[PDB]
Structure 1
């Protein structure tokens, strides 16, 4: 059975806050299609080949 992920229990309280002290600049990537292969068909040659 596939696991959805690890279990983490945030210690929620009324007077408990977590402020980060350091930072980690990360560079991610995202691939997005933009164009497509422009095609054109010949009705005569395809249907009636020679």
Structure 2
């Protein structure tokens, strides 16, 4: 059974970047993304 529920907004996932003093993250792959933007003219 479903009901109407009220909640506080989640702004997104919490991500603690592994920032360090001499540490770097470098991508070994890539993705080709095709996104869409609709604009009234």
TM-score, with length taken from structure 2 = 0.77
Structure 1, unmatched stretches of 5+, are 34-50
Structure 2, unmatched stretches of 5+, are 1-7
Q: CA deviation at 1:11?
A: 0.7
1:12 and 1:26 map into 2 onto residues whose CA distance is 27
Q: Which has the larger radius of gyration?
A: 1
Q: CA deviation at 1:17?
A: 0.2
2:24 and 2:15 map into 1 onto residues whose CA distance is 16
Q: How many pairs does the alignment contain?
A: 33
Between Structure 1 and Structure 2, the one with more strand by share is 2
